[PDB]
């Protein structure tokens, strides 16, 4: 709701309590699109998928198959 400059600590906290849910759901997710380098394009399943080297894992590990 509208939390103004005339609010108490308990309500400030309650407002955070209810409005932090979306941020909680965002944890362990990927919010923004990424730029990546294609490292594998030979898809054994013939589904035109490619493997990438995303900067998050620093090319240390390989990623999942990514669909077109």
């Amino acid at each position: 709701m509208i939390v103004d400059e005339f609010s108490s600590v308990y309500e400030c906290l309650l407002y955070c309590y209810k409005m932090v849910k979306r941020s909680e759901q965002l944890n362990g997710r990927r919010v923004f699109p990424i730029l990546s380098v294609v490292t594998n394009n030979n898809d054994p399943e013939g589904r035109r998928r490619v493997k990438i080297a995303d900067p998050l894992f620093g090319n240390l590990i390989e990623s999942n198959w990514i669909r077109p």
Binding site: S8, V9, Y10, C12
Partner: peptide, 24 residues
């Protein structure tokens, strides 16, 4: 007891207004 429980809200509330004013 309830008087002091309340006095404690008043304190905590004002302490947390102090922090609001204490920060850039």
């Amino acid at each position: 007891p309830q008087a002091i429980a309340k006095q404690i809200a008043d304190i905590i509330n004002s302490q947390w207004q102090g922090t609001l004013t204490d920060y850039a």
